[PDB]
Each structure stands twice: as C-alpha cells, then as structure tokens.
Nucleic acid binder design. Structure first.
Lengths: 206, 87, 129, 81, 150
RNA sequence: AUUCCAGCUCCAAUAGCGUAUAUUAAAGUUGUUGCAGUUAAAAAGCUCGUAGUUGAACUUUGGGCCCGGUUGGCCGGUCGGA
RNA sequence: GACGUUUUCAUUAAUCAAGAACGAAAGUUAGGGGAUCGAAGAUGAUCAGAUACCGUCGUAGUCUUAACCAUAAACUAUGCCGACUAGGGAUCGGGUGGUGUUUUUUUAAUGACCCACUCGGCACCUUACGAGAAAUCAAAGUCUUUGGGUUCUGGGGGGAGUAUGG
C-alpha cells in the first residue's frame, strides 16, 4: 504494501461515484458482505469503493509479475465491455477474447481456439458461464467482478460494481488498465489523469 | 519419512493449502498458485519477489472461495480493511 | 435427547470441519468433554480452545489448524485390558506410527499409549485425529 | 468466523435473534416503574403482564391483558430504566 | 420434543447469568418474604399466587430476591396443598374431559384426550411416590379424578 | 471340430496323484467388530404403555524449593565410552 | 397447536416385549328413512372375436343409530427422539413499530403495506460437499476415515404367505 504512490484518493472517486455504483444488486445470497456498507432506503446496496480500489491495487500485482505479457487474457461475453478488452489489448499486451465462448475452448488442445493462458480476467461471470465452469480445469486464477447476485463460486477477486449501464464496466477496466500501464510504468499519481480519457473504454450505440 | 540412517523418502515432496490448511495433490484441477509481486516507493511491481498463495479445490467449489482470500491479503501486509477481522 | 453429550460433541465438529469451519459452539459440555478436549489440545490435533460459561451447561470454542480429520465416540464405552488396547489399535487406526484412541480410566483421561506408559488400561472413549 | 473469537464478533448481529440463540442468554422484555393517574404511587406492572391492575386508590382497571405484551389504560408516566 | 403431542414448542422463561438482586429493586429479603407470606395466606394455588402478585407488586420471582421457593414457603406456614399445583389442575383437565364425556357419549377424541392426561397423572403420581411427597398407599383413579377438584 | 474316437505329442504332481461326502477358508451370505430395508427380499395402520435398553450439566487449577532415573555434546580429561 | 412471559415441578425422561385405544373403503348383527345411483341380477342387446366397450330397471349397499371387523399403492413406497449446513422469495400462526407511504381516529388508524426480525406448519428449486449401482435424495447425509439412543422385519428364485399347529 500500500504505497505512498497510491491509495484511496477522492479524485478517482470522482469516476466511480460519477457512475452511481451505489446502485448494486437488490438481493444477496449470503457470501457477499466484506464490501457493502449499507443500502439506500428501498434496499439497493452501497459499495465500499475504497476497498474496491484496493481490489485493483492487488489486481495489478497479479498482472505485472509475469515475464510474459502474451500470457494475459481477458474474456468479455457481455456486450458492454466487448470494446473494452480491445481497448485494453493493444494498450496492455493481453490477447483479447469477446463474443461466444467456444464449448471446449480450454479443452481440446488440437483445435484452433485453444489458448494457453497464465492469467485470465473475466467480465461477467454469469454471462461467461462456461468460461467460469470449464476454465477451472487447467488451474487458472479467476479475476472477476461481483455485483450482489454474482458468483462467489470459483472466484477469488470479487470486485464489487454494477453491470447495468455501459460506464461501470469500462470504468473499472480503465481504472485497472491505467495503473497496469503504470506498473509497467509511464506515470505516477491518481489525482493526475492519464493522457487518454476514461471515456475511451466505453460502449458506442451503432 | 527417513531410513535407518536418515535419507528422506518419496519424491514429490508436496505443497499445502493456505486456506483450509489441507494438502494440494498433483491430481488437483482447481489449485491455483498466485504470485503477488510487491510494491514499494515508486509503487510499481518488483516482479520476481512474490507473496505466493495457493488455493485448493474444496474452497473453490462449496460460496466460500472468495472471503477466505480476503484474510490472507489482510494478514500479510497487502490490503487494509478489505477483510473485516471484526466480521 | 443428548444421551451422550460427548457424542453430540465432535459430530458437531464433524459437521463443522467436513463442512469447513474453524470453530463450533458446543452446548452442553461437561468435564468429560472439557478434559477430553484438554487431552486433544495436549496432542495438538485440534488447537486452542476456550470454555465460556453460563449458569447452565456451558460452551466451548475451538481454534484448530485443520488436522482434526475425524474423531468419534466408540460408544458403548467398552472396558479394556492391557493387551487388548492393541487389538483396538489395528481395527480402527490409520497406521502404527501415529494415531490415538483415548481412554477414561481410574487414572483419569489419557490416550492408550500413556496407558501403556503409566501401566493401566481402562474404558474406551473415542478415536481422534 | 474466519479469524475472530466469538467473544469478539460483530456484537449486536445476533442480539434480537430469539434470546437464547445469542452467545449467552439474555431476556427480551423490560421492567417499568410507573405511577397510576389515581394515586401517583409507583405501581410496577410487568411489561408482558397477565393481570388486570385494579388501582391502589380507585377500582379502575388500568390495563387490559394481551399476548406479547399487555395493553395499559392511558395515563401512565414513563421514564428510562 | 413434546410427549403425547407430536409437536415442537418453546414457552420461554430464560434466565441471565447474574444471581443476586442486580441493579434497581430496593426492598430487603424480609420485605419480599413477608409479601409472599401475605400472598400465601390468601388460600389459593401457587400458580394463582404467582400469576397475580408477581405481576402487580414488582416481585421478580419467588426465588431470586426471596430465597425460599413457594412450596417451601407454604410448608413452613401450615398451608401446604394436598397435591401440589399441577397434578390437581391435570385432574381438573380430567374433570372437564369426563364431564364432557357424558354430555355426549361418542366424542371419540375425548376418549383419546383423556388417555394422555391420565398417563401424565400416572407419571406424576409415580414421581411423587418416588420422592415421597405423595403417600404411596393411595393410587390415582378415575373414580377420584372428578370428585377431588370440584 | 482347438471342444468327437484314436495316433502322436505335450502339461502338471511325483511313489504319488485323482474321486465321493463332511467341515473350514475366501463368504460384510450371520455382520459386536462388520452387512442390508424409496424402488432390488425386508418400516410395519397409527397412538398409549410395562419389562428391558440408555438418560442433561457440577465438585482441588496455575506455580515455587530441590531431588536430577534418561538425553542432546560444543566437553573429548577414557581414545567403542561419561 | 403456535406464540409471548424474570410464573410452578426440579429430571417428573426417549422409544418400546407384554398390555390397551382408534381404524378408510369394503364386509359383518338388530333398527330408521328408503331421495340418489348402483358389485350381483332380471331384461333388451347386437353382429361371427371392426370389439364386445352399449343401454335400461335394480334387492341389499351408499346415509345414519346400539356394536363389530382390523384390510390398502393405510404410500411422503422412508419407525421414533438428537446435530449442523445450505440458499432463497413467499406462505401461514404469533410477536414489533421506522422524523416509513396513502381512504381516514388525525403523516405510519379499522385493516394493510416497503424495509427488517423472530419462532410454528405446508412447500419448492439450486450447485450436490455427502451419498446410492442408478432414477434420484438438504436427507434415502455426518458409514471401510465403519459405534448419538431405542423397536420391528430380510437372507437366491420359486415351491409359498402354501401346508401344519397355536
């Protein structure tokens, strides 16, 4: 650790509170109270976003340790972040995956769509159904996102957000990608903006 | 473990779970080894020196997969109040 | 009815450990169960435990480190001679070079090898690891 | 539950959860030391009363018994503990 | 788990840790003892004593601030009941059931509901012959289970 | 016709090989260790009940003075031993 | 029965050989009505065994009264008291009132609500950690890592729930 370079700052809390992720999910299977604080008085859960920031703090420790940027993989079957992974990819070096997850992708080492990942970041771990189920065979860590009805099964990094509105997903994608590029090393601070917008990783309406 | 004069026995000296304190076998198809590189001043990575975690199979199968790793990031010096000790 | 509180002990810690806990709340509890668990902590299969009290039965909280795989009462509480404890070893213990049946006896409560050491043998209680 | 003793939990989480299920036993209801509108003498009726209180000066039935807790006749001054 | 009923139930009177008079009740033991002696010479069953004048005079119980329990109270007074409080009212239940037994003859559950009450009176008579508070010559009988309450 | 009558030829045990019944073993098919009853044989119509079989929780801990039977050996003054 | 209670017994307890209540439908003796259909039966069928399903009247029976019987796929095909775990939106029986929202006792009165909370009954479906041979099962679990307590049955198919006896 938690450096003097970066911790909870109220200038990246501009971004998250500008997305209104005090609008969580509305009913909670009970494995999901290390990161809630309360709920608005009709019952929609408020997120401890500084701990959601600590989630990306250790999420970049996970990423920048590998001496193989090719070994970084991101999955997005939900449409919203399907831009965002490419917005990640040529920025970071991760190989992008979006669309339909081919049944037996991590199975069947003979076929074309067989990947050899060392690290996988998922986007919607219900919509990435057989990317949660069939991925934990070849012993892969599951960097996930967790609204309040999202799976506590098979995950280890449960990042709390919403998935209703195109800004939240690409927002936390950008908030991790900025410091991943800064763990690889370009810039320093958090009240300091990066050279390219947080608007960049968002979803068009064609 | 050791013969008439010492001489430790049975290659593949295994490794252990750090969540249930169970064992991780070479069969296993859920156990994940996590390399957490550090931070410091300038706050980047120090890639190579690692807080190595290991996650076995029962935790990842039977809700309790996530909160059991909040404790390890807390009680090593990696994250702050992501894991309510006062749970 | 809790005909053996010692039985509706560790079955509770089976239903805690097999279901993956680090503790359970045992109520009722006796000095039977208290010294039973002191013996188990002395062996260190289970870890630290605390008796908390009311003006009723009482509660115990245990802080182990996993190594309690299985325990169980061997009810009915059979009465065993010196040579016959080793019969009870090879029926229901993993290997020769570890593993403990424990005993209540007129020398109190101790495992069957401290029975071999302090040279008695008494009534069975359970098998513990 | 992960690492905390159950002398050291979040405290009031199980506090309303049906008295005896709590970490020790502590009763639900409360005592009241209140005075009637007929004497201003402190007439301690129990919160979950089962007895219809005739006044100590009047013959007025100053409460009506109901399950859960009872239903007093209005005019009883309350204060804390 | 109930006997004779096949249901689950909790009718609560739970007690916290502390024994003595904790915080607020300002009378001595002699005051609440003489209050219970006042209550006892009214000539009613100990259920009827407690249900009224534990509730109308700030009495907590007859054991915490008092010290001597109620059937110990009445035997030091000469007004100790014949059959104490509960076997009598179970005979009262038997009275009610047996007087409805001849209002109408074929009330078939009343034949079933007398058996449970009769069995619990057999157990209470046997337990009160155990600790020798009932004299072990007399036996409970249906020919005395309707002429002994009312 | 590798399975029939024979000719070969070969296989075993070897002054020894078969056969008949009886028991034991493998046989958790007698089960205290140590079975099985939703559908494979097996939970009864449901209560009350006696004999039997069990039956809630509590009773002297922690530590000081030494004795040192046994061991670790830097001691090695005995050169397998105190 | 549930629920509330800082009321009373202080172990009065679980099942259960023997023993005793109850008991569908049907059936069994002595009566009431005798409306309804209607096992048997009395008739018409009606052509080969398109198949004999049709149709019409029907003693008793169905309904009850003084009594039996003691039989079901009497089945949720799972004896009864214990322990814990899932995970849920409702239910119903109780208990509470949010600077809680409206007809109106007067913003939350009669009642009923969103958000919470408790014990009782009836249920559901998830991943099955555990099983099972398997359909499936939150118990048909905590059983080869074999022992919480207690009662009745089963030992290949038949022969046969037959003979025989009580």
């Amino acid at each position: 650790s938690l450096p003097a370079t970066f911790d909870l700052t109220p200038e990246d809390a501009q971004l998250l509170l500008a997305a209104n992720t005090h609008l969580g999910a509305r009913n909670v299977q009970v494995h999901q109270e290390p990161y809630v604080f309360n709920a608005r008085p009709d019952g929609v859960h408020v997120i401890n976003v500084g701990k959601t920031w600590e989630k990306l703090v250790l999420a970049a420790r996970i990423i920048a340790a590998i001496p193989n940027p090719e070994d970084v993989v991101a999955i997005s079957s939900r449409t919203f972040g399907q831009r965002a992974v490419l917005k990640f990819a040529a920025h970071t070096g991760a190989t992008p995956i979006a669309g339909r997850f081919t049944p037996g992708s991590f199975t069947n080492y003979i076929t074309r769509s067989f990947k050899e990942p060392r690290l996988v970041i998922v986007t919607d771990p219900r919509s990435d159904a057989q990317a949660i189920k069939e991925a934990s065979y070849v012993n892969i860590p599951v960097i996930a996102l967790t609204d309040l009805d999202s799976p506590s099964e098979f995950v280890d990094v449960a990042i709390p957000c919403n998935n209703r509105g195109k800004h939240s997903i690409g927002l936390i994608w950008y908030l991790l990608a900025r410091e991943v590029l800064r763990l690889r090393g370009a810039l320093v601070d958090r009240t300091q903006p990066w050279s390219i917008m947080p608007d960049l990783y968002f979803y068009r309406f064609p | 473990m050791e013969n008439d004069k010492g001489q430790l026995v049975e290659l593949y000296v295994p490794r252990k779970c750090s969540a249930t304190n169970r064992i991780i076998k070479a069969d296993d198809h859920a156990s994940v080894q996590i390399n957490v590189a550090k931070v410091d001043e300038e706050g980047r990575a120090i890639p190579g020196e690692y807080v190595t975690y290991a996650l076995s199979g029962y935790v990842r199968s039977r809700g309790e997969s996530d909160d059991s790793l909040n404790r390890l990031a807390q009680n090593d010096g990696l994250l702050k109040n992501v894991w309510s000790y006062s749970r | 009815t809790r005909s053996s509180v010692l039985a509706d002990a560790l079955n509770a810690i089976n239903n805690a450990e097999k279901t993956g806990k680090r503790q359970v709340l045992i109520r009722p509890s006796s000095k039977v169960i208290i010294k039973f668990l002191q013996v188990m902590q002395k062996h260190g299969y289970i870890g630290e435990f605390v008796y908390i009290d009311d003006h009723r039965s009482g509660k115990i909280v245990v802080q182990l480190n996993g190594r309690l795989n299985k325990c169980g009462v061997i009810s009915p509480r059979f009465n065993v001679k010196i040579g016959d404890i080793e019969k009870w070893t090879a029926n229901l213990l993993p290997a020769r070079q570890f593993g403990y049946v424990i005993l209540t006896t007129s020398a109190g409560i101790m495992d069957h090898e401290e029975a071999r050491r302090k040279h008695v043998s008494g009534k069975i209680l359970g098998f513990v690891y | 539950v992960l690492v905390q003793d159950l002398l050291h939990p979040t405290a009031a989480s199980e506090a309303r959860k049906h008295k005896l299920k709590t970490l020790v036993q502590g009763p639900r209801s409360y005592f009241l030391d209140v005075k009637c509108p007929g004497c201003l003498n402190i007439t301690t009726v129990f919160s979950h009363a089962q007895t219809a209180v005739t006044c100590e000066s009047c013959s007025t039935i100053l409460c009506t018994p109901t399950g859960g807790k009872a239903k007093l006749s209005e005019g009883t001054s309350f204060r804390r503990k | 788990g109930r006997m004779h009923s096949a249901g689950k139930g909790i009718s609560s009177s739970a007690i916290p840790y502390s024994r003595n008079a904790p915080a607020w009740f300002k009378l001595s033991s002699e005051s609440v003892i003489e209050q219970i002696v006042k209550y006892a010479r009214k000539g009613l069953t100990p259920s009827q004593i407690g249900v009224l004048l534990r509730d109308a005079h700030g009495v907590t119980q007859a054991r915490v601030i008092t010290g001597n329990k109620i059937m110990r109270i009445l035997k030091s007074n000469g007004l100790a009941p014949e059959i104490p409080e509960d076997l009598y009212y179970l005979i009262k239940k038997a009275v009610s059931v047996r007087k409805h037994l001849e209002r109408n003859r074929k009330d078939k559950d009343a034949k079933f509901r007398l058996i449970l009450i009769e069995s619990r009176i057999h157990r209470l008579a046997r337990y009160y012959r155990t600790v020798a508070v009932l004299p072990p010559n007399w036996k409970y009988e249906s020919a005395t289970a309707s002429a002994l309450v009312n």
